[PDB]
């Protein structure tokens, strides 16, 4: 009984960990993507000025 229950808790907590990591770090990826796009836009504007 104790074998079974310990294994179940182990697996469940590990799954929760994995889901949280993947979700949040995907959000980070797209955020910095947006930053890159904005910076490229301002650079283009300056070039047109010149």
């Amino acid at each position: 009984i104790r074998n079974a229950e310990a294994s179940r808790l182990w697996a469940s907590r590990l799954t929760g960990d994995s889901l949280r990591i993947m979700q949040d770090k995907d959000q980070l990826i797209h955020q910095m993507q947006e930053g890159t796009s904005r910076n490229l836009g301002q650079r283009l504007s300056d070039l047109g000025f010149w």
């Binding site: 796009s37 490229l40 836009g41 650079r43 283009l44 070039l47 047109g48």
Partner: peptide, 9 residues
């Protein structure tokens, strides 16, 4: 340069 940056971004 501008054309290159345009077709990239």
């Amino acid at each position: 340069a501008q054309y290159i940056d345009e077709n990239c971004f």
